[PDB]
Amino acid sequence: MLEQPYLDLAKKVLDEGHFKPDRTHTGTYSIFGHQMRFDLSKGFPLLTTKKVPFGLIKSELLWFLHGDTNIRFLLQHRNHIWDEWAFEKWVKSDEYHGPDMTDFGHRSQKDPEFAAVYHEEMAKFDDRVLHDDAFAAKYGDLGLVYGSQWRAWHTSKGDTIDQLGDVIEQIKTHPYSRRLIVSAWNPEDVPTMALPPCHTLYQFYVNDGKLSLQLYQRSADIFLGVPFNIASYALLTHLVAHECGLEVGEFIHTFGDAHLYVNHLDQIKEQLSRTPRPAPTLQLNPDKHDIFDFDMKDIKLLNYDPYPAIKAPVA
Amino acid sequence: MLEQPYLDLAKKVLDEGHFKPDRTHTGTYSIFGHQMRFDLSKGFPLLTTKKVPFGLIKSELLWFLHGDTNIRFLLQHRNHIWDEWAFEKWVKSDEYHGPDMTDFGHRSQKDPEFAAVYHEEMAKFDDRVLHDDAFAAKYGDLGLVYGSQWRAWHTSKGDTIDQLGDVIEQIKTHPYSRRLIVSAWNPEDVPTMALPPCHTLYQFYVNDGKLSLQLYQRSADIFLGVPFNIASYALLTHLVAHECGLEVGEFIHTFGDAHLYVNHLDQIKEQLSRTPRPAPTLQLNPDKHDIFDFDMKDIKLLNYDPYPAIKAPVA
Numbered sequence: 109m110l111e112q113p114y115l116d117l118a119k120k121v122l123d124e125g126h127f128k129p130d131r132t133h134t135g136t137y138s139i140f141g142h143q144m145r146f147d148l149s150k151g152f153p154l155l156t157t158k159k160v161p162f163g164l165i166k167s168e169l170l171w172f173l174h175g176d177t178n179i180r181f182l183l184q185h186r187n188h189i190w191d192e193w194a195f196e197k198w199v200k201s202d203e204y205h206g207p208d209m210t211d212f213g214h215r216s217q218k219d220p221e222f223a224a225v226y227h228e229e230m231a232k233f234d235d236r237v238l239h240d241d242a243f244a245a246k247y248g249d250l251g252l253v254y255g256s257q258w259r260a261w262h263t264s265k266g267d268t269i270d271q272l273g274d275v276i277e278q279i280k281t282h283p284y285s286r287r288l289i290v291s292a293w294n295p296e297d298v299p300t301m302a303l304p305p306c307h308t309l310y311q312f313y314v315n316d317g318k319l320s321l322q323l324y325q326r327s328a329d330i331f332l333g334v335p336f337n338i339a340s341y342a343l344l345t346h347l348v349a350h351e352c353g354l355e356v357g358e359f360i361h362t363f364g365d366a367h368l369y370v371n372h373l374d375q376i377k378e379q380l381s382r383t384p385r386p387a388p389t390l391q392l393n394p395d396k397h398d399i400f401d402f403d404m405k406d407i408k409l410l411n412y413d414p415y416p417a418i419k420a421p422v423a
Numbered sequence: 424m425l426e427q428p429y430l431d432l433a434k435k436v437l438d439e440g441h442f443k444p445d446r447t448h449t450g451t452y453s454i455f456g457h458q459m460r461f462d463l464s465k466g467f468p469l470l471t472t473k474k475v476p477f478g479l480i481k482s483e484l485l486w487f488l489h490g491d492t493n494i495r496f497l498l499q500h501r502n503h504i505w506d507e508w509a510f511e512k513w514v515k516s517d518e519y520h521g522p523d524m525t526d527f528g529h530r531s532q533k534d535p536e537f538a539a540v541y542h543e544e545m546a547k548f549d550d551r552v553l554h555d556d557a558f559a560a561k562y563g564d565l566g567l568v569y570g571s572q573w574r575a576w577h578t579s580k581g582d583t584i585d586q587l588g589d590v591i592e593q594i595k596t597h598p599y600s601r602r603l604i605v606s607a608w609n610p611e612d613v614p615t616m617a618l619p620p621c622h623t624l625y626q627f628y629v630n631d632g633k634l635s636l637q638l639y640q641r642s643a644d645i646f647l648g649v650p651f652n653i654a655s656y657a658l659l660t661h662l663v664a665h666e667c668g669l670e671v672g673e674f675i676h677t678f679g680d681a682h683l684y685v686n687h688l689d690q691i692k693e694q695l696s697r698t699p700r701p702a703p704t705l706q707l708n709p710d711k712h713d714i715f716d717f718d719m720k721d722i723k724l725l726n727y728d729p730y731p732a733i734k735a736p737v738a
């Protein structure tokens with residue numbers, strides 16, 4: 109049916125699997141280069157042979173059009189998609205006196221109560237982020253992240269240029285530019301970074317009164333990740349047509365390396381025996397128009413009917 | 424046969440043709456998003472149902488690994504691929520007294536002796552570029568071009584970082600990074616530019632002892648252009664395996680907008696009635712190893728057997 113693109117690309121990775129020792133080696137099957145397109149006029153690509161929580165996706169984009177850098181705005185939206193990159197600077201200097209959490213992702217997975225003592229200082233931290241307007245300001249500004257690279261390309265002669273606002277005055281002044289590309293890749297401070305831009309850039313497009321958006325994703329976690337991304341940018345495509353007043357068209361997801369972590373192989377097999385349902389229709393608050401200035405109540409998903417949620421070994 | 428990817432992508436543009444009034448409107452058929460892959464181990468992708476001059480292609484890459492900005496090095500290689508962007512600053516201040524060449528591409532095409540009076544002051548200029556070591560230094564440094572964005576990403580705290588040298592110490596220290604991406608897109612001075620990066624970026628890859636390279640091309644001129652690009656980066660892929668000491672693998676060309684200028688429609692039809700020949704094998708000077716420090720005599724193309732050269736209405 110409609111989500112069929114996504115679902116094929118676990119088939120080819122099985123049947124083309126290059127087995128890479130990468131990670132801490134740990135195990136992966138990859139491929140290199142893949143495009144896979146989606147008709148956004150058909151229905152909205154939320155995955156129906158798995159249950160993908162639409163809340164945490166928009167809670168994260170609305171982090172992104174708000175130009176926002178701060179763990180505090182996602183937390184107070186129950187969003188726990190980003191914690192550990194700013195809990196990486198809790199295990200970092202002073203105030204941090206006497207738990208460890210030294211490169212903790214690892215020993216929590218290979219834990220019993222370690223994951224839990226990490227789960228309790230981490231929690232201490234999260235609720236600081238919530239309540240004191242200065243510690244929060246400190247550990248919480250992640251600085252180079254999308255909200256910033258979207259809404260403030262930082263220049264030499266230290267200005268901030270917002271790629272997103274300019275490219276959509278360009279879709280409003282000039283429909284046909286082959287130059288509506290926003291790029292999250294800054295080579296200067298790419299090697300001073302922790303996680304370089306996964307979504308490297310996105311080109312947009314106006315064909316027949318209607319708009320598309322194309323994505324070069326430099327690395328992708330096929331199971332434990334991609335279902336989410338399909339929606340994050342297929343919802344984006346939907347909200348900037350809402351500001352330019354055009355129609356919706358195609359989300360092209362194009363890939364560089366796409367892999368399937370080998371710890372997950374049983375689990376991707378199963379939902380590939382699932383049979384698709386129809387896919388929901390996303391509809392945005394009509395009367396309001398700046399996507400940049402949207403809250404939560406401004407996107408409702410309707411008739412979404414997932415299969416049960418398949419559990420992580422994380423990624 | 425091998426070049427068959429390229430040759431299909433004029434078929435789909437005919438049969439999918441979105442007719443865009445863009446240019447000075449002038450006329451185009453586009454599409455939006457396209458990938459098309461190439462097996463570099465099969466043979467080298469020089470087009471055999473048209474004659475594509477291999478000289479001006481490598482004369483231009485060797486402009487590019489030399490980190491070079493200067494019209495003078497290409498001229499003294501008979502390369503006339505870049506002239507008018509620096510002849511755009513001949514029609515610009517002083518010394519320029521008394522021809523016109525005001526936005527001359529146009530009136531030369533709609534000329535008789537205009538193209539020729541432009542062809543004679545332009546020529547005056549080209550041979551200045553050749554002989555006086557200061558005027559040359561002036562009109563000839565184009566500044567933001569590949570040699571510069573490849574070999575000197577210019578930072579805030581005004582350093583120059585060479586993306587190419589670092590990414591190939593990364594292919595030599597670390598085969599499996601999903602972060603070997605060089606990006607020619609600088610959003611700061613993209614809107615202060617004349618022609619923004621057409622080749623936006625390229626990701627590389629090491630699977631099985633062997634290397635691939637992927638290209639996001641943001642706009643492409645299907646007939647009067649693309650045959651050339653297929654070779655420029657499929658030769659690149661070949662020379663950085665020569666420095667990392669690996670094998671050759673795949674050149675993925677992926678596209679954002681690909682068009683076919685409508686003035687050319689008769690002409691693409693014809694070579695689509697041509698039947699492919701085999702494709703040459705490119706072999707590089709073995710004993711020498713820095714591609715950055717290659718001259719001309721360091722790549723020989725052998726057994727290349729084109730069909731005749733189809734003539735331009737330019738692009």
Ligand SMILES: O=c1[nH]c(=O)n([C@@H]2C[C@H](O)[C@@H](COP(=O)(O)O)O2)cc1F
Binds near residue numbers: 600
């Ligand atoms: O949804 C996600 N998709 C994804 O591709 N990553 C990645 C990909 C890779 O497995 C790792 C980052 O590593 P690298 O940056 O080296 O690709 O996290 C993370 C997510 F949360």
Ligand SMILES: O=c1[nH]c(=O)n([C@@H]2C[C@H](O)[C@@H](COP(=O)(O)O)O2)cc1F
Binds near residue numbers: 285619
């Ligand atoms: O080989 C070439 N391929 C190509 O795509 N361009 C382009 C594409 C487009 O037709 C124009 C640049 O316009 P824009 O930058 O708006 O895409 O020149 C130029 C070449 F010489």
